[PDB]
Design a protein around this ligand. Sequence first.
Ligand code: ZN
Ligand code: ZN
Ligand code: ZN
Lengths: 447, 85, 136, 78
Amino acid sequence: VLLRAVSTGLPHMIQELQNHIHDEGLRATSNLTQENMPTLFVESVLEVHGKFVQLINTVLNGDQHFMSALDKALTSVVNYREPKSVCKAPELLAKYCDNLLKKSAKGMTENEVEDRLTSFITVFKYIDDKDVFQKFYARMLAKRLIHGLSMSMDSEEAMINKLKQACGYEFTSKLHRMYTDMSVSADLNNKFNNFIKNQDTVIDLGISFQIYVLQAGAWPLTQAPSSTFAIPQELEKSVQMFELFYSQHFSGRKLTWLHYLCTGEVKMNYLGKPYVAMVTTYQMAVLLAFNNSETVSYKELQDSTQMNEKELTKTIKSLLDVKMINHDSEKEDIDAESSFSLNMNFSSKRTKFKITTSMQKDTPQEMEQTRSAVDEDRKMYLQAAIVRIMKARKVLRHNALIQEVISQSRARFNPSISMIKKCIEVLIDKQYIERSQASADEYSYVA
Amino acid sequence: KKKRFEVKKWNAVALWAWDIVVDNCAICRNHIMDLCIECQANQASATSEECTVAWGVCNHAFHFHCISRWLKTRQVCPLDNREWE
Amino acid sequence: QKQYNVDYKLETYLKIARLYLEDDDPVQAEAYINRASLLQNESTNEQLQIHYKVCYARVLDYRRKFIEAAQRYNELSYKTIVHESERLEALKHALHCTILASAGQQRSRMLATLFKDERCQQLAAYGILEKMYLDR
Amino acid sequence: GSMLIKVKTLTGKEIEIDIEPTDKVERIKERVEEKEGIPPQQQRLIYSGKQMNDEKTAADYKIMGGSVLHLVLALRGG
Ligand SMILES: [Zn+2]
Ligand SMILES: [Zn+2]
Ligand SMILES: [Zn+2]
């Protein structure tokens, strides 16, 4: 009352309010956030979301400076939390989507979910690593795309509307085309049955057409990694007849190869086992590596490896735990000390079902994917530092220019001597700096 | 027949980029993703991956007077060796 | 699936190319040389690079793209690196395009360079064309 | 010139010049070109990622002795 009229009285109150709001954010953001999960992370910060929607809708009823202040330090620790992908809560948000937007495992109701969703929208001002989250959420999609960590597609679509308002724009339509693209996956399964009527091999069941188009450039890193593989004849027919339909449709991206769609095909092959124990992608590929040779050393597999290892450590581990392998080591691929038989035993519920257990692990993977982010954030920082130099002084030469550029950022890191050309090239496009007549090097500044 | 791991039903792979280079109309880098400066000023039907993208009679799918621009840098246009269009 | 480096695929491109040219199906080979064109930024094999340059200029002739191969053969045979036999052969094809390319101001300055050319002081129709240094 | 500021090329060529605390960078350009042959119109004076107006005073941007007047400038002069 008094320091609103005593008018500057209030601003001190908003001050130390900002101090306990803030450092309360530091500790309380620091305390129950040891497990780093959506609930705590997202619900400790959305927990204060409760503390101050309920604090500040109340008595409290105006000093809008309180509004911009709670929004200010709230937004600050919105960029002051456990990462530096501090959309980890947004990550967790969609991860919450991940663990909740799932029709079977953790299933809810839309507007049961969507209550939580509109509270996410409450945060939507504050979800703040949108393209960090695009990279990370294309990985999330790699846990979602075929997988189902996003039940409520259209909640995600209204979220997309929100975003492409104030956030990423074509990641949205990228997932759209993916959606309609597995729609087309079913459709060309249909047409394949229509057109080829492909009795190429006797066993046509489930031979491919599942497709989920996110642009080839729309991926967080390179492919779900792939290497050599058997690819029996029907797989030939799949890629080729799809390319029939599809070179009819589109060309330039085509039936590429991508392992992580792979799963296990070990069924009534001819088994005393009545067992169908599907396996993960490279579970499939490396079990493929060990089919007929009733035992195989590290060297026999090492013949046709041309790949990495962990595929087969998952292989022997899932094969011994269930007892589907008469192995010798569960190691990354295998000891040369160790080898490979198809054991008959099984350890789970059904007719050898639920052996489909990719370990489903990253800490070592978490870091590998963190590497991609360094390259895109350094590139952005550099584009701005580069244009700003280029406007200031027009060098501008090619060679000398790149050298001087080197001089300005001695501290940063070691650049490519070549690509110097490309560097100026990048600025040539933006209308930032032009190419002079005088030399392949030594251009001029424009705009 | 109890194991030799014969064929189950399987699922497959796709794309959709394009059957062209296209490299973002290299004459600048307001991209082929982008309606560039001059050809946001001109702007035919042009989109976030083909602002101009094709293996054309040029095949140098270069923006209107951006293609004209790097034809300015050489009126023989060896860009992909067709005249700026 | 199989990856080659530039040079094997490129071999096949130039192979396809010169072959159809001997067959005179120019535009198929045109299709594929334009695929082998772009790679010019990558490979450094100036030898095979310029084998490819020259089949291109052959096409330009075949294409009735005269001045273009004219400029090519002109500035290319200007250099001693090539079999000077094959240089003067390109010097032909340059000048053969000079005449087969349109009456030009590019061509005028071409013909002026060609007037400043000393190699063709050997040549027969040097004299012929040199008649026409001033519009004979 | 009472204000002894630096005119700096893109490569870091900081040049010591006598100007005034209201001396026009319009004429400071004249000074940089009359001193270094590099003419000022590609000596694009940018101040902290944002261009300095060619028609202003150096001290308009609190420019002082060790201050920087950006070129981006040319190489043939120098
Ligand atoms: Zn643009
Ligand atoms: Zn284009
Ligand atoms: Zn235009």
